[PDB]
Amino acid sequence: DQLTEEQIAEFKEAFSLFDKDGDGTITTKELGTVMRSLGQNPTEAELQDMINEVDADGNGTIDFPEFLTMMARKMKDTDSEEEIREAFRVFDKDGNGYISAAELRHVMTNLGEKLTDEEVDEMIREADIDGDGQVNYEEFVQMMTA
Amino acid sequence: DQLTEEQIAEFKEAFSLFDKDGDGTITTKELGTVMRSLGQNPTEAELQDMINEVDADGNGTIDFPEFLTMMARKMKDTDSEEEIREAFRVFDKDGNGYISAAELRHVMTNLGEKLTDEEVDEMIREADIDGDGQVNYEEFVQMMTA
Amino acid sequence: GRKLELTKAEDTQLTKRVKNAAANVLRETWLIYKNTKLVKKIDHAKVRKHQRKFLQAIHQLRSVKMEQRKLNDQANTLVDLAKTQLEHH
Amino acid sequence: GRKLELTKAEDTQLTKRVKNAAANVLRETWLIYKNTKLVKKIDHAKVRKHQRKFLQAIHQLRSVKMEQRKLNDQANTLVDLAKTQLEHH
Ligand SMILES: [Ca+2]
Ligand SMILES: [Ca+2]
Ligand SMILES: [Ca+2]
Ligand SMILES: [Ca+2]
């Protein structure tokens, strides 16, 4: 629950990601816009609750010092290996721990924001350790998260 | 995923808890009413999803045989000891494993649907094993769930 | 830098929901117990009634817990976005 | 009878959300990895961009999972209410 100088500064930049009109306060409306830009859909009550958790003076908005407290209480991070492995598992059609190079290209060039067939070539070069045209995605994820 | 005769019959009575107008089908609207009567608040999309999971013919409502399948897939039950203990924990102000007889009466005669001070007397007679005016709620819950 | 790591996890109205629902868990646990273990003669209509009330209370507490997990992840989403600004230079 | 026991636990739109979000987890994991471990010279603006996209995808998958847990408990609520009719006579 303690923060450094450069982090206080970098979090000021962060505050601007939320305070869209730059008026020094984050409203539920601004928070809704940001949360939706991340593909979430908090309800009105959820937006109010997120503001209320850290709204120390009860004025209904988050200011910069309130924003820093939310942060100080949650600077701790944790590795994402399992969640990333679960995301690969979505495409493991036969549940055998493998995704073929062909199927990975097919996923990555059609779904989500996509990679080019060329970016896919670099990803598969790294992922296909054995040169067998198959990706052991548990192993690949362990490598990237090591 | 198999059901007996008397259970098929008792589940027909159950179907009537949901099929409010007795027209042989449960709609999202009827399900909403029932779910709210239980103090829940499913959204429109959640009501549609619950119907869709078991809506085998895709007509948008649950009939009796669809209703029996939802059941057959989930006849298995499990004990509620921990969840009940957690509910008592809510009232363990000092986090010491005890709720005093006085505090239990105060909770039960003011909060929720309530017990009478007399019903409270029967509950405390059972709960206060040691006659010390204190309820070890872990032990009391273990007794009731044994 | 933080690479692929993310924030480590783990209201008045929700709190009100909790005390009332938790009191009713206690209420209905006691009344089911009494009517199934402490009577000479089990009244099944009574047990059914208190089973409905018991499941409603238990499921209300589950709903609160799920909502708190949702809220917590929303907050962690805000923190994670903020933490992208820690990636410098 | 069942006394205090309850049903033991554990969509097209939600599924669509999953494949797109999961593909983006793969996308952004790869691009963060590449830009932090496979380059001679780390471009932090690039890493920041892909960290935002990565957290958004991961949190989208969390949201789906939470919603499925919510749906599952709603279904278990219906089943529990139905099961009160098994208490006879
Ligand atoms: Ca503002
Ligand atoms: Ca404030
Ligand atoms: Ca009907
Ligand atoms: Ca149907």
Q: Return d(Cα C24, Cα B114) in angstroms, integer.
A: 7
Contact C77, A37 (CB under 8 A): no
- Domain boundary, last residue among A37, A58, A79: A79
Q: Return d(Cα C87, Cα B13) in angstroms, integer.
A: 61
Strand, coil or helix: what is A110? coil
Do B5 and B59 sit in the same domain of this protein?
Answer: yes
Residue A24 CB neighbour total at 10 angstroms: 10
Residue C68 CB neighbour total at 10 angstroms: 14
Contact B81, B92 (CB under 8 A): no
Q: Where are the alpha helices (DSSP H) in chain B?
A: 5-18, 28-37, 44-54, 64-72, 81-89, 101-108, 117-127, 137-144
Q: Return d(Cα B66, Cα B141) in angstroms, integer.
A: 36
Nearest to D87 by CA among C24, B77, B37, B143: B77
Q: Return d(Cα C9, Cα C73) in angstroms, integer.
A: 8
Strands B98-100, B77-78: pairing is unpaired
Amino acid, single-letter form, for residue D83? K
Instruction: Report resolution in angstroms.
Output: 1.5
Do B66 and B104 sit in the same domain of this protein?
Answer: no
Q: Which helix (H) or strand (E) holds A145?
A: none
The most distant pair of C-alpha atoms in chain A lies apart, rounded to whole Å, by 61
Is B52 flagged in the annotation as binding?
A: no
Q: Return d(Cα C1, Cα D46) in angstroms, integer.
A: 13
Is the backbone of residue B104 left (phi > 0), alpha (psi -120 to 50) or beta?
Answer: alpha
Sequence-distant (6+) residues with CB within 8 A of A92 are A98, A99, A137
Which domains does chain D carry? 1-89 (1.10.287.70)
Q: Return d(Cα B22, Cα B9) in angstroms, integer.
A: 16
Name the closest ligand to CA B27.
Answer: 3
Q: Which residue has the tokens 């190079």?
A: A101
DSSP state of B90: T
Which of D2, D3, D52, D73 is the best residue to mutate to test the C interface, defined by the most C CB atoms within 10 Å of its own CB? D3
Contact B25, B62 (CB under 8 A): yes
B62 forms beta bridges with: B26
Contact C58, C25 (CB under 8 A): yes
A136 forms beta bridges with: A98
CB contact under 8 A, D55 and C85: no
Tell me the two tokens of residue A1. 């629950």
**Technique used:** X-ray
Do A1 and A41 sit in the same domain of this protein?
Answer: yes
ω into residue C50 within 30 of 0, thus cis? no
Q: Return d(Cα A90, Cα A82) in angstroms, integer.
A: 13
Tell me the two tokens of residue A114. 């996509």
Do B64 and B120 sit in the same domain of this protein?
Answer: no
Q: Does C70 lie at the interface with A, CB-CB under 8 angstroms?
A: yes
Tell me the two tokens of residue C48. 């059914």
Strand, coil or helix: what is A136? strand
A65-91 burial, b for 16+ CB within 10 Å, e for fewer? ebbbebbeebbebeebbebbbbbbebb
Do B75 and B21 sit in the same domain of this protein?
Answer: yes
Do B74 and B120 sit in the same domain of this protein?
Answer: no
For chain C, the first-to-last Cα distance in angstroms comes to 10
Q: Return d(Cα D29, Cα D34) in angstroms, integer.
A: 9
Tell me the two tokens of residue D31. 């691009």
Do B98 and B109 sit in the same domain of this protein?
Answer: yes
Q: Total structural domains in chain B?
A: 2
Tell me the two tokens of residue A115. 């990679």
Q: Return d(Cα B12, Cα A40) in angstroms, integer.
A: 40
Residue A64: phi and psi, rounded to 5, are -60, -45
Cα dist from B34 to A8, A85, B37, B59, C50, whole Å: 51, 39, 5, 21, 17
Q: CB-side exposure of A65: number of CA atoms within 13 Å?
A: 2
Do B1 and B70 sit in the same domain of this protein?
Answer: yes
Do A61 and A4 sit in the same domain of this protein?
Answer: yes
Q: Does D46 lie at the interface with B, CB-CB under 8 angstroms?
A: no
Binding residues of A for Ca(2+): 19, 21, 23, 25, 30, 55, 57, 59, 61, 66, 92, 94, 96, 98, 103, 128, 130, 132, 134, 139
Nearest to B44 by CA among B28, B64, B23, B60: B28
Chain A residues within an 8 Å CB radius of C70: 46
DSSP state of A75: -
Domain membership of residue A134 as a residue range:
80-142
Do A105 and A132 sit in the same domain of this protein?
Answer: yes
- Domain boundary, last residue among A79, A109, A129: A79
Q: Return d(Cα C55, Cα C32) in angstroms, integer.
A: 11
Do B6 and B50 sit in the same domain of this protein?
Answer: yes
Do B4 and B75 sit in the same domain of this protein?
Answer: yes
DSSP string for residues in A100-141? EHHHHHHHHTTSTT---HHHHHHHHHHH-TTSSSEEEHHHHH
Residue B30 CB neighbour total at 10 angstroms: 19
Contact A35, C81 (CB under 8 A): no
- Domain boundary, last residue among A53, A79, A105: A79
